[PDB]
């Protein structure tokens, strides 16, 4: 609307090759390639946003005289068909969702 630039540079992509993810219980879990409803099978895809390499330009437009700062990747919980053990499981997994600026005192 008025914003010309972000304080943090990010990258947003479709993730179609996900094999591992940490669930809500903080445990490493195997992510399945396919899910289904009563009729059709679907390939598992996720939308992910993360910080671009530096972590930026220190965030952009930060008052350096008063604050130390860095861009950091934050996450969301998305439901995914996974494998806990022998059984298949529709569980909440942690995935990259944003790139935010975090401040620290000088």
């Amino acid at each position, epitope marked *: 609307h008025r914003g010309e630039f972000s304080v943090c540079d990010s990258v947003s992509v479709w993730v179609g090759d996900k094999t591992t993810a940490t669930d809500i219980k903080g445990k490493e879990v195997m992510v399945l390639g396919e899910v289904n409803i009563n009729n059709s099978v679907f390939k598992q*895809y996720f939308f992910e946003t993360k910080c671009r390499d530096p972590n930026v330009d220190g965030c952009r437009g930060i008052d350096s005289k008063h604050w130390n700062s860095y861009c950091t990747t934050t996450h969301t919980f998305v439901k995914a068909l996974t494998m806990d053990g022998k059984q298949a499981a529709w569980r909440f997994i942690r995935i990259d969702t944003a790139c935010v600026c975090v401040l620290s005192r000088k």
Partner: antibody, heavy 121, light 108 residues
Framework: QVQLQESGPGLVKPSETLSLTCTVS????????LNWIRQPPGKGLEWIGI???????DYNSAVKSRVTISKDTSKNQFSLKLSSVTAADTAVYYC???????????????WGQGTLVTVSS | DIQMTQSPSSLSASVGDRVTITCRAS??????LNWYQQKPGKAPKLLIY???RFHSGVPSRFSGSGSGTDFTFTISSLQPEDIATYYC?????????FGQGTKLEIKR
């Protein structure tokens, strides 16, 4: 690093099928969307269709019955097929990749240089 | 289908001038509007996305504004390299639609 290059025959006979490929590099065809946009000589731009990262498509209603957009990740290519071709299809065809700023904003960030396709007997 | 109407269709202005291009949507598109610049014989190049956001390698002289139905593209100090056809583009709903373009020439 990001490169898109369209190719195809500059001449298609009316009622035949127009066939274009878009050869890419610098990004994965699984994580990015590809769009086909056309520009008739001396005219504006028209979006024809999209192939999202997941492989799902959507075509503009104006051309819908004649459009086929596919992708070959092994050959780093995207195809466009426009059936039952007429002089209204004479245009510079562009392949453009879509880019996202979260799920908030979408834009055509990288374009090919375009290939002119003429429909004539 | 949302229709984008750009004004003026064509414009001549001197180097150093402030140029203002308008984009008008048929229905509200909120902030889902992009601006492209197409140089003679070249593919369109993205300048602005989400009404006012700068893409990579865009001059500080360019800017975007607007909301819902009314949008603006400004060149603060028009330069000789700005010779191009500018297009606005709606991304609020499918199908994606562009304005008819604003041809920009230089008075010299």
């Amino acid at each position: 690093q990001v490169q898109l290059q369209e190719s195809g025959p500059g001449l298609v006979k009316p009622s035949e099928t127009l066939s274009l490929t878009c050869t890419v590099s610098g990004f994965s065809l699984i994580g990015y969307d590809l769009n086909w946009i056309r520009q008739p000589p001396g005219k504006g731009l028209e979006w024809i269709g999209i192939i999202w990262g997941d492989g799902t498509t959507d075509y503009n209603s104006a051309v819908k019955s004649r459009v086929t957009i596919s992708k070959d990740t092994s050959k780093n290519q995207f195809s466009l097929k426009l059936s039952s071709v007429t002089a209204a299809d004479t245009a510079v065809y562009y392949c453009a990749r879509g880019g996202y700023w979260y799920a908030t904003s979408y834009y055509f960030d990288y374009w090919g240089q375009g290939t002119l396709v003429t429909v004539s007997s | 289908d949302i229709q984008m109407t750009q004004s003026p269709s064509s414009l001549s202005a001197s180097v150093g001038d402030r140029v203002t291009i308008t984009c008008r949507a048929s229905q509200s598109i909120s902030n889902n509007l992009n601006w492209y610049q197409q140089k003679p014989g070249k593919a369109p190049k993205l300048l602005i996305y989400y009404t006012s956001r700068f893409h990579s390698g865009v001059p500080s002289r360019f800017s975007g504004s607007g909301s819902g139905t009314d949008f603006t593209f400004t060149i603060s100090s028009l330069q000789p390299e700005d010779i191009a056809t500018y297009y606005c583009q709606q991304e609020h709903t499918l199908p994606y639609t562009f304005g008819q373009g604003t041809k920009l020439e230089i008075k010299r």
